Amino acid sequence: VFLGFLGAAGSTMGAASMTLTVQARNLLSGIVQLKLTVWGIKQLQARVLAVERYLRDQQLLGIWGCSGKLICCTNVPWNSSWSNRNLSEIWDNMTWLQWDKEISNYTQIIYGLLEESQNQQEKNEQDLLALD
Amino acid sequence: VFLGFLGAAGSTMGAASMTLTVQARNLLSGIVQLKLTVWGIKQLQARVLAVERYLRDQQLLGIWGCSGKLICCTNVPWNSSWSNRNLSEIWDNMTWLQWDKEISNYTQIIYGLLEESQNQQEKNEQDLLALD
Amino acid sequence: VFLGFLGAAGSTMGAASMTLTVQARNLLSGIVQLKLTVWGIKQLQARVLAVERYLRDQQLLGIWGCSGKLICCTNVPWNSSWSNRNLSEIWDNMTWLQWDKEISNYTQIIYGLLEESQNQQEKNEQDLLALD
Amino acid sequence: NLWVTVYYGVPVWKDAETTLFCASDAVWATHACVPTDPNPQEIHLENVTEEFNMWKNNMVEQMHTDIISLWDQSLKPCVKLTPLCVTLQCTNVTNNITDDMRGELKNCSFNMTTELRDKKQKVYSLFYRLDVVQINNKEYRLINCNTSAITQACPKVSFEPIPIHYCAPAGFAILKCKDKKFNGTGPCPSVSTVQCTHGIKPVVSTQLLLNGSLAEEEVMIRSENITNNAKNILVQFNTPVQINCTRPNNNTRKSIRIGPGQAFYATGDIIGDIRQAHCNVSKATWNETLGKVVKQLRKHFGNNTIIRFANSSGGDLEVTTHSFNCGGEFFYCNTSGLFNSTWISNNDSITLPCRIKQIINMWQRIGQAMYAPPIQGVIRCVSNITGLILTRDTNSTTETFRPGGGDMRDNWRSELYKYKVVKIEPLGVAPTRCKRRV
Amino acid sequence: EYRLINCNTSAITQACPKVSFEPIPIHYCAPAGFAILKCKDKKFNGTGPCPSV
Ligand SMILES: *[C@@H]1O[C@H](CO)[C@@H](O[C@@H]2O[C@H](CO)[C@@H](O[C@@H]3O[C@H](CO)[C@@H](O)[C@H](O)[C@@H]3O)[C@H](O)[C@H]2NC(C)=O)[C@H](O)[C@H]1NC(C)=O
Ligand SMILES: *[C@@H]1O[C@H](CO)[C@@H](O[C@@H]2O[C@H](CO)[C@@H](O[C@@H]3O[C@H](CO)[C@@H](O)[C@H](O)[C@@H]3O)[C@H](O)[C@H]2NC(C)=O)[C@H](O)[C@H]1NC(C)=O
Ligand SMILES: *[C@@H]1O[C@H](CO)[C@@H](O[C@@H]2O[C@H](CO)[C@@H](O[C@@H]3O[C@H](CO)[C@@H](O)[C@H](O)[C@@H]3O)[C@H](O)[C@H]2NC(C)=O)[C@H](O)[C@H]1NC(C)=O
Ligand SMILES: *[C@@H]1O[C@H](CO)[C@@H](O[C@@H]2O[C@H](CO)[C@@H](O[C@@H]3O[C@H](CO)[C@@H](O)[C@H](O)[C@@H]3O)[C@H](O)[C@H]2NC(C)=O)[C@H](O)[C@H]1NC(C)=O
Ligand SMILES: *[C@@H]1O[C@H](CO)[C@@H](O[C@@H]2O[C@H](CO)[C@@H](O[C@@H]3O[C@H](CO)[C@@H](O)[C@H](O)[C@@H]3O)[C@H](O)[C@H]2NC(C)=O)[C@H](O)[C@H]1NC(C)=O
Ligand SMILES: *[C@@H]1O[C@H](CO)[C@@H](O[C@@H]2O[C@H](CO)[C@@H](O[C@@H]3O[C@H](CO)[C@@H](O)[C@H](O)[C@@H]3O)[C@H](O)[C@H]2NC(C)=O)[C@H](O)[C@H]1NC(C)=O
Ligand SMILES: *[C@@H]1O[C@H](CO)[C@@H](O[C@@H]2O[C@H](CO)[C@@H](O[C@@H]3O[C@H](CO)[C@@H](O)[C@H](O)[C@@H]3O)[C@H](O)[C@H]2NC(C)=O)[C@H](O)[C@H]1NC(C)=O
Ligand SMILES: *[C@@H]1O[C@H](CO)[C@@H](O[C@@H]2O[C@H](CO)[C@@H](O)[C@H](O)[C@H]2NC(C)=O)[C@H](O)[C@H]1NC(C)=O
Ligand SMILES: *[C@@H]1O[C@H](CO)[C@@H](O[C@@H]2O[C@H](CO)[C@@H](O)[C@H](O)[C@H]2NC(C)=O)[C@H](O)[C@H]1NC(C)=O
Ligand SMILES: *[C@@H]1O[C@H](CO)[C@@H](O[C@@H]2O[C@H](CO)[C@@H](O)[C@H](O)[C@H]2NC(C)=O)[C@H](O)[C@H]1NC(C)=O
Ligand SMILES: *[C@@H]1O[C@H](CO)[C@@H](O[C@@H]2O[C@H](CO)[C@@H](O)[C@H](O)[C@H]2NC(C)=O)[C@H](O)[C@H]1NC(C)=O
Ligand SMILES: *[C@@H]1O[C@H](CO)[C@@H](O[C@@H]2O[C@H](CO)[C@@H](O)[C@H](O)[C@H]2NC(C)=O)[C@H](O)[C@H]1NC(C)=O
Ligand SMILES: *[C@@H]1O[C@H](CO)[C@@H](O[C@@H]2O[C@H](CO)[C@@H](O)[C@H](O)[C@H]2NC(C)=O)[C@H](O)[C@H]1NC(C)=O
Ligand SMILES: *[C@@H]1O[C@H](CO)[C@@H](O[C@@H]2O[C@H](CO)[C@@H](O)[C@H](O)[C@H]2NC(C)=O)[C@H](O)[C@H]1NC(C)=O
Ligand SMILES: *[C@@H]1O[C@H](CO)[C@@H](O[C@@H]2O[C@H](CO)[C@@H](O)[C@H](O)[C@H]2NC(C)=O)[C@H](O)[C@H]1NC(C)=O
Ligand SMILES: *[C@@H]1O[C@H](CO)[C@@H](O[C@@H]2O[C@H](CO)[C@@H](O)[C@H](O)[C@H]2NC(C)=O)[C@H](O)[C@H]1NC(C)=O
Ligand SMILES: *[C@@H]1O[C@H](CO)[C@@H](O)[C@H](O)[C@H]1NC(C)=O
Ligand SMILES: *[C@@H]1O[C@H](CO)[C@@H](O)[C@H](O)[C@H]1NC(C)=O
Ligand SMILES: *[C@@H]1O[C@H](CO)[C@@H](O)[C@H](O)[C@H]1NC(C)=O
Ligand SMILES: *[C@@H]1O[C@H](CO)[C@@H](O)[C@H](O)[C@H]1NC(C)=O
Ligand SMILES: *[C@@H]1O[C@H](CO)[C@@H](O)[C@H](O)[C@H]1NC(C)=O
Ligand SMILES: *[C@@H]1O[C@H](CO)[C@@H](O)[C@H](O)[C@H]1NC(C)=O
Ligand SMILES: *[C@@H]1O[C@H](CO)[C@@H](O)[C@H](O)[C@H]1NC(C)=O
């Protein structure tokens, strides 16, 4: 069922995952459509910042070997120190906003392993499987 | 054989598909290379609009799980109401311009299922194949 | 071991390949953060040129069926005329700068086959494997 | 059964307007412009046909306003002539007796404010009676002062038309028909495409078109509506018609330091061959070409009608006569000597009297005016007449036609008709026998 | 009788009493894709190879 932009924002993370694309589209949006003038360089600046805003994180997903995004798995195990809750305590009983409230503390820390571990090791390995 | 930019424009859709990349390159092109001044914000605006113009549709191909574009298949069946012709009546006897002349009527309609169906279902499923 | 931006620049191509991502991140960088004014359209222009600079080559990697970049293989064989050296003479005894010094002569020439051969043939073929 | 297959890089497009930008080589207003490629590319497109429409081609509109913008920008940093608006004390100039030149200029003098804001200086300058008007020796006034302020064009900047190329941004294509035939709109059997347009010179002129492109085959007649005499007619020639115009006056430039700081270039003295400026036209050539034009006209009005040519309806000098720029000087010529003929049912050379103005108004624009500095020495030049701007005038045989203009978008359109801009849509889908596996 | 020397060459503008002319340390940065290289070699002829970059 089509809910609308951010229509699942007020639901559990499990439920919300159903309709990530409805949001995804408008994360970059597009369209929009005497010189200078007020707004003359503001629509300019804003529309630029939108593009940068998008790609800055998209590239990270490019690095984190997935690309086929919205959702993908890794080979990095979850450290229990990063909010030790059960799946039903998390996915079936918590919104994404509530999630960030806690996990945001380890953002860069988790990014470290995502930015690396697998990306490093998945490769070489393959290069070696190509030996024969 | 290298034809040139849009060199296959005047051929059947089957034939034209041979050299989609020759076109693809220049869809974004690149290069190009007293303040303000006429042209001062026009080359600016234009070069920006080129980038947006490109990515707006590229993201759709990102959503429509392919990425490795120019051509890819889906798991959405073709509805016969969308111009009921045979393959030889289409691919071996029609240009892309002639094609759009008709199919353009159902553009957003087809996009609906492309934007969704598979993208929704292909996933979850996988998540379930990962159970073991 | 984290070296830093371009930290492996002064090492063999084999060694340098270890930490390509450390460089990759800052190839686009991001962040950064009376009208006009000096710098008023310079930070503008520069930040734009960064985006273009990036994507212009990224699209090529999009065309060259890899996407999961930093490293990927092809089905194009290496022509011996393109600097005939042994692997130990190349990978274990040469920096990337030294490499370009020579191979730069055949840049566009090699791009020809990369831009094409495989991209053309890998496909069709698949379309045919989909027959059943 | 067939499935939805996604395609990208599809060679299709829709007619659409975007922001074009220039290119030209490496004077007028062009410097801030991307150099052209040393190898402009093209490609004829076989089996590709579609309609053009020069009458709704918005490329013209952009070009027009862009040229205007350039004009203004080139004047802002130049010297304003605000303090020139004073009472002038003027007298006749005794040209070689008795009087063939009719004077046309007055030996005007006036108390002028100088760099020493305080003590003024009695100075003089020669002005054309087209620039000044009697108040109420006698008292005269600079004509512009009743309408707006006037700015002196810099002596360094020129007005020489320079070939400009137009390019579309990525995702947009420049389409160009090569069909030698064209009615002004409709399908073209032979369509090609280019990176950018050919070099077009921004030549401003009325009535006559100068230094444009040539037509192939026969003379071309193009009009939004031939039958509607509220419209007009564009005529493109096949062969360049030489015109050679001269101003035989080795005059000086008594520049006056009407600062502070900024300098004004007044008119010094006029010496040499005191003859009226005029143009030389090869008469037999004109007659021959005109005939070729009439042939076309015959072909859209009948094989039993009469064609007459006459001058304009009169009125505003800018429309009445042929206006054009040569070397910074502005000429107004009586084209009655050309447009005076007739054709039935089925050296020699021509001298065209011209006048010189120093105060002019561009593109029918009121609210501002520009002062041309006098150009020192004898001024003479030559150009190619490449087309006509004609209008259509008891309607069962004889029809009369006459020169017009005014709207300079007409001039740009006379060239840009060969081009149109379309927006490419890379993304497409089609039915294909294929079921996609995991 | 005397004259302001500038008046024979051009107009002259008064600098605002609020604005100053104190030199302030400025840093220069390159956009992404470009690098700022800096030799630390205490020796330098004005041009040539630097052992320590
Ligand atoms: C907004 O939050 C409310 C709770 O404050 C959520 O309420 C839940 O709404 C659904 C739909 O009405 C209820 O689900 C239905 O429950 C019955 C019985 O359990 C079951 O038979 C149905 O198959 C269905 O699941 C759910 O029980 C109800 N929860 C409670 C606490 O009453 C609602 O889901 C929230 N919306 C967002 C977008 O998260
Ligand atoms: C432009 O449209 C024309 C038709 O108006 C297309 O003509 C086709 O051109 C090819 C090449 O000359 C012909 O193919 C050859 O035909 C012979 C006999 O069938 C066969 O022995 C060869 O192996 C080859 O296929 C084709 O027959 C001809 N079609 C007709 C109607 O004469 C041309 O392909 C079009 N170009 C574009 C880019 O689509
Ligand atoms: C900078 O260039 C220098 C050479 O000018 C490179 O020196 C190499 O440094 C490594 C680390 O000190 C040495 O590796 C060690 O060698 C011993 C014996 O072979 C081995 O037992 C160790 O396992 C280890 O590989 C290496 O021998 C030394 N090379 C030479 C010529 O002395 C250094 O690697 C360069 N750095 C960059 C980033 O390329
Ligand atoms: C600027 O040129 C004007 C002429 O274009 C000069 O005008 C002269 O101005 C003076 C002062 O207003 C007039 O003088 C007065 O005339 C009356 C009657 O003749 C006499 O009763 C007074 O004693 C006095 O002389 C003079 O007549 C007038 N000239 C004319 C033609 O109207 C003015 O002098 C010039 N300034 C410069 C600095 O030369
Ligand atoms: C146009 O009006 C100007 C004044 O606005 C007249 O200027 C006069 O020009 C002559 C020739 O340059 C000057 O005559 C020469 O003066 C010197 C010194 O008085 C004398 O040595 C020479 O024998 C000769 O007469 C005259 O002084 C100058 N007048 C002023 C006010 O500077 C010019 O005559 C006018 N032309 C017409 C056709 O009336
Ligand atoms: C080319 O433009 C001309 C004029 O701009 C168009 O001519 C117009 O043609 C129609 C049909 O012959 C005339 O309409 C008829 O007028 C009479 C009297 O006003 C009225 O009784 C009828 O009911 C009808 O409206 C119209 O007057 C005539 N206009 C003029 C200026 O004579 C012609 O239609 C244009 N062609 C194109 C393709 O648009
Ligand atoms: C184009 O040449 C024609 C002649 O071929 C010129 O015609 C002249 O036009 C004016 C305006 O319609 C006529 O002037 C009016 O005449 C009446 C009676 O003489 C008078 O009462 C008015 O005050 C006014 O002057 C003039 O007579 C007419 N000439 C003839 C021969 O009919 C027209 O002036 C020419 N245009 C150009 C720009 O020279
Ligand atoms: C999970 O990450 C935590 C830090 O977020 C790691 O914590 C370390 O735990 C050991 C054992 O208690 C201590 O010796 C360290 O001092 C702790 N570090 C800090 C920052 O407090 C823990 O090692 C991590 N587990 C995994 C498997 O890497
Ligand atoms: C193919 O799409 C068409 C609409 O483009 C669908 O048309 C419906 O067809 C049924 C049967 O004739 C009618 O009850 C509906 O009213 C039609 N809809 C409209 C918009 O006219 C058809 O259902 C589609 N087929 C598939 C398999 O979904
Ligand atoms: C490798 O590329 C070289 C060009 O870089 C090719 O060289 C050709 O070699 C043959 C045999 O010596 C000559 O007939 C040609 O004239 C050479 N070309 C030029 C440009 O010199 C060589 O063919 C290439 N090999 C592969 C397998 O394609
Ligand atoms: C300047 O010479 C012109 C002629 O070149 C004179 O013109 C006369 O002006 C008056 C007023 O407008 C008219 O009554 C005459 O009919 C005009 N003559 C002609 C030939 O048109 C003018 O008088 C002269 N001024 C001086 C001071 O003598
Ligand atoms: C501004 O001055 C112009 C002349 O420079 C005046 O123009 C006259 O206007 C009337 C009405 O259109 C015409 O009868 C005259 O022939 C025009 N003169 C010329 C030289 O063309 C206009 O009247 C002036 N405006 C003001 C308010 O006085
Ligand atoms: C007038 O137009 C003619 C074209 O009809 C131009 O002719 C060129 O003249 C030069 C000098 O004789 C030759 O180098 C060219 O090859 C001629 N072109 C052609 C088409 O024959 C001439 O340049 C034009 N004059 C103006 C000032 O543009
Ligand atoms: C006007 O009469 C001429 C002949 O005097 C006609 O000329 C024909 O024109 C067409 C088109 O150019 C050619 O196909 C014919 O071969 C021409 N005939 C000859 C004799 O050369 C023209 O058709 C006539 N127009 C009218 C409306 O009937
Ligand atoms: C229009 O041009 C014709 C020539 O095409 C001119 O004709 C002259 O007319 C006068 C009056 O009838 C005669 O005295 C001449 O002998 C005619 N010349 C010839 C060649 O026959 C007429 O003067 C022109 N009109 C304009 C205003 O210049
Ligand atoms: C502008 O005024 C300056 C002085 O303020 C003049 O400068 C003199 O120029 C000559 C020629 O170079 C030298 O002999 C003098 O020594 C200069 N004076 C000084 C103060 O340096 C210059 O001549 C003036 N220009 C005008 C047109 O009078
Ligand atoms: C994990 O959930 C189980 C019930 O599924 C519960 O017994 C345990 O308390 C939970 N974890 C926490 C930290 O309490
Ligand atoms: C995250 O840690 C910061 C201190 O680093 C603290 O202020 C905040 O309460 C922490 N959040 C969690 C959920 O403990
Ligand atoms: C489909 O093509 C077959 C021949 O291949 C033909 O018999 C049938 O008429 C075609 N479809 C249409 C709608 O006619
Ligand atoms: C597409 O439908 C529109 C009306 O919605 C119609 O104007 C046009 O003719 C249609 N095209 C096709 C091929 O039927
Ligand atoms: C390739 O290396 C081998 C040793 O591994 C050597 O014998 C041969 O000389 C090398 N190639 C070149 C061109 O010399
Ligand atoms: C590359 O070839 C150019 C000439 O095309 C030459 O100047 C340069 O030396 C060449 N480099 C190599 C390594 O031979
Ligand atoms: C122009 O020549 C035509 C014949 O080609 C003739 O009818 C007409 O009289 C000519 N005009 C001139 C001025 O001689």
From TrEMBL, chains A, B, C:
Subcellular localization: Virion membrane; Host cell membrane; Host endosome membrane
Glycosylated sites: N79, N86, N93, N105
| Annotated TM spans | 1-18
Q: Which cysteines are joined by disulfide bonds?
A: C66-C72
Native species: Human immunodeficiency virus type 1
> Where is each Retroviral envelope protein GP41-like domain found?
13-132
Please report the record's description of how this protein sits within the membrane.
Single-pass type I membrane protein
Q: Per its record, how is this protein called by name?
A: Transmembrane protein gp41
User: Per UniProt, what is the name of the gene that codes for the protein in this document?
Assistant: env
* Region described as Immunosuppression: 42-60
Q: Which parts form a coiled-coil structure per UniProt? A: 101-132
Q: Where is this region: Fusion peptide?
A: 1-15
From TrEMBL, chain E:
**Would you list which residues are glycosylated?**
N8, N45
Give disulfide pairs as residue numbers.
C39-C50
Compartments reported by the entry: Host cell membrane; Host endosome membrane; Virion membrane
Task: Output the PTM entry.
Answer: Highly glycosylated by host. The high number of glycan on the protein is reffered to as 'glycan shield' because it contributes to hide protein sequence from adaptive immune system. Palmitoylation of the transmembrane protein and of Env polyprotein (prior to its proteolytic cleavage) is essential for their association with host cell membrane lipid rafts. Palmitoylation is therefore required for envelope trafficking to classical lipid rafts, but not for viral replication.
Source organism's superkingdom?
A: Viruses
* Described purpose of this protein according to its UniProt entry: Envelope glycoprotein gp160: Oligomerizes in the host endoplasmic reticulum into predominantly trimers. In a second time, gp160 transits in the host Golgi, where glycosylation is completed. The precursor is then proteolytically cleaved in the trans-Golgi and thereby activated by cellular furin or furin-like proteases to produce gp120 and gp41. Transmembrane protein gp41: Acts as a class I viral fusion protein. Under the current model, the protein has at least 3 conformational states: pre-fusion native state, pre-hairpin intermediate state, and post-fusion hairpin state. During fusion of viral and target intracellular membranes, the coiled coil regions (heptad repeats) assume a trimer-of-hairpins structure, positioning the fusion peptide in close proximity to the C-terminal region of the ectodomain. The formation of this structure appears to drive apposition and subsequent fusion of viral and target cell membranes.
**What does the record's miscellaneous section state?**
HIV-1 lineages are divided in three main groups, M (for Major), O (for Outlier), and N (for New, or Non-M, Non-O). The vast majority of strains found worldwide belong to the group M. Group O seems to be endemic to and largely confined to Cameroon and neighboring countries in West Central Africa, where these viruses represent a small minority of HIV-1 strains. The group N is represented by a limited number of isolates from Cameroonian persons. The group M is further subdivided in 9 clades or subtypes (A to D, F to H, J and K).
Task: Please state which protein family the record places this protein in.
Answer: Belongs to the HIV-1 env protein family.
What does the entry's domain section say? The CD4-binding region is targeted by the antibody b12.
**Protein's name in the database:** Envelope glycoprotein gp160
Give the species: Human immunodeficiency virus type 1 (HIV-1)
Q: Which gene encodes it?
A: env
